[PDB]
Design a protein around this motif. Structure first.
Motif, mmCIF file in Angstrom:
data_model
loop_
_atom_site.group_PDB
_atom_site.id
_atom_site.type_symbol
_atom_site.label_atom_id
_atom_site.label_comp_id
_atom_site.label_asym_id
_atom_site.label_seq_id
_atom_site.Cartn_x
_atom_site.Cartn_y
_atom_site.Cartn_z
ATOM 1 N N UNK A 74 0.838 -1.190 0.000
ATOM 2 C CA UNK A 74 0.000 0.000 0.000
ATOM 3 C C UNK A 74 0.879 1.249 0.000
ATOM 4 N N UNK A 75 0.260 2.405 0.210
ATOM 5 C CA UNK A 75 0.994 3.660 0.231
ATOM 6 C C UNK A 75 1.800 3.787 1.517
ATOM 7 N N UNK A 76 3.054 4.212 1.388
ATOM 8 C CA UNK A 76 3.899 4.423 2.547
ATOM 9 C C UNK A 76 4.602 3.202 3.089
ATOM 10 N N UNK B 260 19.202 13.935 4.339
ATOM 11 C CA UNK B 260 17.846 13.625 4.772
ATOM 12 C C UNK B 260 17.467 12.161 4.588
ATOM 13 N N UNK C 155 0.662 2.467 -14.583
ATOM 14 C CA UNK C 155 0.318 3.863 -14.821
ATOM 15 C C UNK C 155 -0.377 3.999 -16.172
ATOM 16 N N UNK D 297 0.771 -2.042 -6.947
ATOM 17 C CA UNK D 297 -0.239 -2.305 -5.932
ATOM 18 C C UNK D 297 -1.597 -2.681 -6.505
ATOM 19 N N UNK E 101 9.448 14.936 2.415
ATOM 20 C CA UNK E 101 9.627 13.513 2.667
ATOM 21 C C UNK E 101 8.342 12.706 2.524
ATOM 22 N N UNK F 123 5.100 10.763 0.658
ATOM 23 C CA UNK F 123 4.974 9.885 -0.495
ATOM 24 C C UNK F 123 4.262 10.620 -1.630
ATOM 25 N N UNK G 8 1.501 9.708 -3.244
ATOM 26 C CA UNK G 8 0.059 9.739 -3.081
ATOM 27 C C UNK G 8 -0.393 10.831 -2.136
ATOM 28 N N UNK G 9 0.305 10.992 -1.011
ATOM 29 C CA UNK G 9 -0.122 12.017 -0.072
ATOM 30 C C UNK G 9 0.125 13.404 -0.644
ATOM 31 N N UNK H 173 -5.121 8.200 -9.600
ATOM 32 C CA UNK H 173 -3.678 8.260 -9.799
ATOM 33 C C UNK H 173 -2.962 8.154 -8.457
ATOM 34 N N UNK H 174 -2.054 7.182 -8.347
ATOM 35 C CA UNK H 174 -1.201 7.004 -7.169
ATOM 36 C C UNK H 174 -2.000 6.746 -5.896
ATOM 37 N N UNK H 175 -3.155 6.096 -6.003
ATOM 38 C CA UNK H 175 -3.975 5.792 -4.838
ATOM 39 C C UNK H 175 -4.252 4.298 -4.790
ATOM 40 N N UNK H 176 -4.037 3.690 -3.626
ATOM 41 C CA UNK H 176 -4.323 2.277 -3.460
ATOM 42 C C UNK H 176 -5.828 2.056 -3.339
ATOM 43 N N UNK I 45 -8.135 3.639 -0.469
ATOM 44 C CA UNK I 45 -8.530 5.037 -0.586
ATOM 45 C C UNK I 45 -9.443 5.299 -1.773
#
Ligand code: ATP
Ligand code: ATP
Lengths: 76, 427, 448
Positions: free
Chosen positions: B70-72, B106, B367, B395, C345, C347, C349-350, C388-391, C394
């Protein structure tokens, strides 16, 4: 700088043979341009600009024959 | 073994002062055979205190590995770490002691306890083995540790020595397609040396404008070979050089460079390899390769008009230019064309150039694709490029539905000892 | 856009008739004080405010792939579903082209807008020109607009019809002239290029509602302006946190504490407890009377908190957002779990959600100053490829949150995945299909 250099030729009192030499150089440049046209766009543009500048200088020499204010007079 | 062959070649080179004797040496040919037999592979990588990851050891298969999460969940960090490791290998191969990309400030973990970040990796070449460690300390921290590059430099040395004696030696491909391929690389709205394709070109992808000139040159060579009627092409180019010199006698640096280009053209025409993998065959293979991924279209042609070249595609009964395609076909056309271009440039000796070895990292494979395309892209890529190792992150469950059990990796977050940690599990 | 002698016709309550009545009245009276209090202006204001902006229908002829097609759009939400190559984006660009002329005529009249590109005309042999037409309905007022272009090489002319847009825009400019903070409709377009808008000069000191009207699309420098606008809001709150508001803070709390300790102490004329309570009551009454505007620290603190909570509504994993002032420069600090994160920092998606929601909130606040809650403003928003860029987790809740947060905004959305289709009513679903009819391939739209 250009005005002083031009006034130098007037000081030297160069004859019409200089105009003949410039015409010969212009003709050689034209022949080179014709050769270039056959089998380099920037080179062609630069040669055309140089040919136009030489033609303008030749017309300036013709106006010198027709006489004009000397570059020495403008310089001083 | 590879080390035995390297030692034998070094001894033969030292004893044989004459270049011909070294070339005829059996040790060099045996080493070339061993290098050709060996297949590039990356067995494992360890990550310590890098971004979210605190401690992890990962093993990758030889054919294909796909990470789903998933995200993150740190999918992009793994790809970045691998590109970090491959950067030093490329830099050392290209030239002596070339500095590479370092770990930024960083990148280290934000936790107070962590003091430094370290990435370790291992590369296996059939029976040979090597490893590399790259580390950077946190800002305002003493006891700085220095990276070890002896193992990588020993890999680069054998490649430089092998390529020094043979001008047709193959090289491993190292490419990394990030998300940036979608902005304008997918869009089209914006002599060639094989050394520039691999060593002088970074792993990231930005512009494909070169692909167009390369295709133009390939088509021009194919047309000249097929139509023939060149007669003394080398003599004609030499006469063109002589005419240019005569015109120069009758901007100067550019004219001299053009004259040198004319001499190079004369030398190329005089050579006339006319190999089995001629220009017309490469052109057909490239076009059919792209057309394999786009079943809707019929043919692709390069049309010359208005003193310029434009790409024409036929769909149904309507002909379209390159700029009128949708985003979806733009992405596939760009990625596949860039895949084939490097394979052709890096392997000019193989009869079938689409068989070289390498490693490819692709992020967000899904994509701008509908599920029907998403259910067959993986098998298409694997069949098209058999001897290449792929690392893909995705994903979408549709992609996961068509992947074998052993090739997947599922990431999870588990709280242990009151601290959240990342784990990797197989089904 | 004429004075006219106010032809009687028959009795009606159309907005246009009120517009003409006001224009006729203005040509005689000169004193602006009387004009500002005329009943005609009040009637025009009420009619304009009650009307709800929404597009009605659209048709496309010989534009890009589409040959002949007509769509009717809902007033709250509509979703287009199809695969690649079915012209999902083409419809959105057609609507943007139509809306650009309306945008242009508000800043200044007789200003051109966006034309048709020469390569967008259909590539068939028998085609000659392309046309796009649309209709806008303000409750009971109907306007229409046509945009067309002839194929290069032809020698027959075509023109555009711009009477409706010019007339409608004149009403907005006229009402804006006599109203201090008149609202304006919202128009926006989030194309596919927004991925690196957030993925990737002289200091501004003056803001205005026309700043958002420069362009119809979102790209590049808009993100930078959002950051400069956010810090401007924060300092405005800090200034109002000081001054006389601190005085009431000190007096009311200490007096209350004086009572509370005594009650807790229970030590031993009844001392001065009654007098202290009377003073506390007087201070509370004065503090309540001193409130002005929104009555919650005017409208600065509430605006800042509203924006922050709106952003936090779409990212439940985060706790709070703060604007730390670094010595070199300012920076924004989030908090996920037990860690403090920087915006660089985050991602991908966020980042997309952060930019999309922040931009919408900024536009709504800028265009609706008088409203107590600016989020209720009307307008139209176009979004392409919401997935786009969302699992998938969400993907199932983005639509309802978008609709609930902004309830009065018309949405046009194109999708690519079946996860979103699981949470959309049949009424607002249009499915694109390809059907060969009469030997010619054509596109159709079918309701579920
Ligand atoms: N220095 C850091 N210390 C702790 N956590 C970090 C640090 N840098 C990033 N993170 C965390 O990493 C998480 C994911 O960000 P990252 O850039 O690694 O994306 P990703 O998960 O690899 O990408 P994708 O969603 O494309 O798979 C963020 O939610 C953030 O909390
Ligand atoms: N001049 C033209 N003549 C014919 N067909 C055209 C022309 N211009 C574009 N097209 C068609 O447009 C199609 C792509 O349209 P469009 O980009 O709107 O669709 P989409 O794939 O649904 O959109 P998106 O992926 O951008 O959301 C192509 O398949 C192409 O055949």
């Amino acid at each position: 700088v250009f005005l002083h250099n031009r006034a130098s030729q007037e000081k030297l009192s160069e004859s019409q043979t200089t105009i003949n030499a410039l015409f010969s150089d212009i003709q050689s440049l034209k022949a080179t341009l014709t050769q270039l046209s056959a089998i380099d766009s920037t080179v062609i543009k630069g040669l055309e600009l140089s040919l136009k500048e030489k033609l303008n200088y030749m017309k300036s020499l013709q106006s010198g024959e027709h006489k004009f204010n000397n570059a020495v007079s403008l310089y001083d | 073994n590879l080390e035995t062959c390297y030692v034998d070649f070094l001894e033969l080179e030292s004893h044989v002062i004459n270049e011909d004797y070294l070339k005829e040496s059996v040790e060099l040919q045996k080493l070339i055979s061993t290098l050709n037999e060996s297949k590039f592979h990356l067995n494992k990588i360890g990550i310590h205190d890098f971004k979210r990851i605190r401690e992890l050891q990962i093993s990758l298969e030889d054919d294909l590995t796909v990470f789903v999460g998933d995200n993150g969940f740190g999918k992009s960090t793994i790809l970045d770490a691998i590109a970090i490791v491959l950067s030093w290998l490329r830099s050392n191969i290209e030239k002596e002691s070339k500095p590479g990309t370092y770990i930024k400030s960083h990148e280290v973990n934000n936790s107070v306890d962590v003091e430094y970040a370290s990435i370790d990796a291992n590369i296996k070449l059939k029976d040979f083995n090597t490893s590399i460690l790259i580390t950077k300390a946190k800002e305002g921290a003493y006891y700085s540790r220095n990276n070890e590059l002896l193992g990588v430099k020993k890999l680069a040395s054998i490649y430089r020595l092998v390529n020094k004696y043979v001008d047709n030696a193959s090289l491993p491909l190292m490419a990394y397609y990030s998300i940036a391929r979608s902005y304008i690389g997918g869009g089209v709205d914006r002599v060639w040396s094989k050394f520039d394709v691999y060593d002088e070109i970074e792993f990231d992808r930005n512009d494909f404008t070169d692909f167009f000139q390369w295709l133009v040159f390939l088509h021009n060579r194919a047309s000249q070979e097929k139509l023939s009627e060149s007669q003394t092409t080398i003599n004609a180019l030499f006469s063109d050089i002589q005419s240019l010199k005569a015109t120069l006698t009758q901007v100067i640096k550019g004219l001299e460079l053009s004259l040198k280009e004319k001499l190079n053209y004369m030398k190329s025409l005089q050579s006339g390899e006319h190999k089995f993998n001629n220009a017309v065959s490469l052109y057909d293979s490239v076009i059919n390769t792209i057309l394999k991924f786009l079943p809707e279209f019929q043919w692709i042609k390069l049309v010359y008009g208005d003193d310029d070249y434009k790409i024409i595609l036929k769909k149904g009964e309507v002909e379209l230019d390159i700029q009128q395609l949708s985003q979806g076909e733009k992405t596939i056309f760009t990625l596949v064309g860039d895949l084939a271009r490097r394979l052709i440039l890096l392997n000019p000796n193989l009869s079938n150039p689409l068989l070289g070895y390498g490693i490819v990292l692709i992020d967000e494979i899904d994509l701008h694709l509908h599920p029907q395309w998403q259910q067959t892209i993986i098998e298409r890529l694997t069949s098209t490029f058999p001897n290449v190792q792929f690392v893909i992150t995705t994903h979408s469950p549709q992609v996961l539905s068509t992947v074998s059990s052993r090739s997947v990796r599922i990431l999870q977050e588990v709280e242990v000892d009151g601290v959240n940690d990342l784990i990797v599990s197989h089904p």
